Amino acid sequence: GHMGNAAAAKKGSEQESVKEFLAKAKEEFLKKWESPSQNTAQLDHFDRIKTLGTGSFGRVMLVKHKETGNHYAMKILDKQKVVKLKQIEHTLNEKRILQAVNFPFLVKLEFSFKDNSNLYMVMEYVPGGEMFSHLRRIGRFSEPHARFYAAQIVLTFEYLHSLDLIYRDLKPENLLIDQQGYIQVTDFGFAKRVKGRTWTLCGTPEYLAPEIILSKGYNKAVDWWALGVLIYEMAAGYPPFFADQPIQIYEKIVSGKVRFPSHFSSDLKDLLRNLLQVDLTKRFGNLKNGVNDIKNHKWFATTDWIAIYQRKVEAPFIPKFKGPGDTSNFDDYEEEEIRVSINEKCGKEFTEF
Amino acid sequence: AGRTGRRQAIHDI
Ligand SMILES: Cc1n[nH]c(C)c1Br
């Protein structure tokens, strides 16, 4: 066969140990899922420094905690802007999931709270910037460097999916580079605990699986499709379904056609054809052997999964860091004052936050 | 041709 006796025994034992790890991680998750934290700080506890990114419902700001001096990333959501029914449910999902998960490649939530106008989530500051801007600046990553980042996503999705969590917004914009060159996934705005199917039309156009676009009930395999899009974009410099307007992107996704740069290795193309698979009975991550079809693929043959988890693999690069609170690895955004109304807004919609 | 800047998520459609 492909593996000799010793290699087959080592892999089987490794796979059993993953099961043991995930069972314990699920017990730890459920304790926190069933007893969330809330109201662990207030706005006046922080000095607001700079906007690190923006979104539909607000911004993420670098803040400095006044008493400790630690820097954090504070996501601010305008409660009124969170107007649509699925916008509201998704924000409750985001906070509840972030407070309960624990994994080396998931950002750590430290505080959450709300006031008359806004919702607030205070996370560890990840100073190396978004993968997005490093990728756009260099053009494309080499296959070994794309593989280093991809392996972290594979392990993170293995963890999340074991907890019945779907992520639903993988993209370089949501992947931050830490001081050791490893990934931190942020933005759980579309993450959801799902036991089987779910039906919300959400995500980012270029990363949507065909079954989302086609208004079908879908499952965690949408995240494996998205991994295919991400790996392709990291290695090519642009995503596989690329067009100026969303409707054109959607038509390309549904077609079942992908073309690859001539510099992609055959191993990479094979992996991508199996992730970017419109037929759910054939998509890697969705078959009998689960995540192992991905982890054991030839393109990952050089990947030491445990060493990646332990953060013992040399990273492709270490961001320059010039002291705490440095924002040099982030783009600039227009600054808008944080106004807190004298009247509580949407109090009933956000009772649980 | 396609989108090179940061991409916003969609809540519908
Ligand atoms: C922790 C975090 N979330 N989003 C950004 C831009 C950071 Br830094």
Technique that determined the structure: X-ray
CA-based nearest distance B5→chain A, Å: 9
Do the Cβ atoms of A349 and A81 come closer than 8 Å?
A: no
* Displacement of CA A178 from its chain's centroid (Å): 14
Measured between beta carbons, which residues in chain A are less than 8 angstroms from residue B10?
201-205, 246
As to burial, measured by CB atoms within 10 angstroms (0-12 exposed, 13-18 middle, 19+ buried), residue A338 is: middle
What strands lie across the sheet with A46-54, from one edge to the other?
A: A46-54, A58-65, A71-78, A118-124, A109-114
Smallest Cα distance from B9 to chain A, Å: 4
d(CA A256, CA A303): 29
Phi, psi of A268 (to 5 degrees): -65, -45
Are A206 and B8 in contact (CB < 8 Å)?
no
* Nearest Cα residue to A221 out of A162, A261, A161: A161
Q: Which two tokens stand for residue A157?
A: 């999705």
**Mind listing the domains of chain A with CATH numbers?**
18-35+130-320 (1.10.510.10), 36-129+321-351 (3.30.200.20)
Annotated binding-site positions of A for ATP: 52-60, 75, 124-130, 171-174
**Within a 13 Å sphere around the CA of A264, how many CA atoms are in the beta-carbon half?**
24
H/E stretch holding A224 reads helix A221-236
Collect all residues of chain A within an 8 Å Cβ-Cβ radius of residue B3. 206, 242-244
Question: Which residue, among A272, A150, A254, has the nearest Cα to A212 in the 3D structure?
Answer: A254
Neighbours of B12 (CB within 10 A): 9
What is the rounded CA–CA span in Å between residue A125 and residue A107?
A: 9
Q: Which of A78, A169, A178, A187 is catalytic?
A: A169
Torsion of CA A338, A343, A348, A353, to 10 degrees: 30
Q: What is the dihedral of CA A240, A246, A250, A251, to 10 degrees?
A: -100
Which has the closest alpha carbon to A232: A153, A128, A286? A153
SS3 call for A106: strand
C-alpha to C-alpha distance for A254 and A252, rounded to whole angstroms: 6
Residue of B nearest to A187 (CA): B9
Q: Which two tokens stand for residue A14?
A: 């490794």
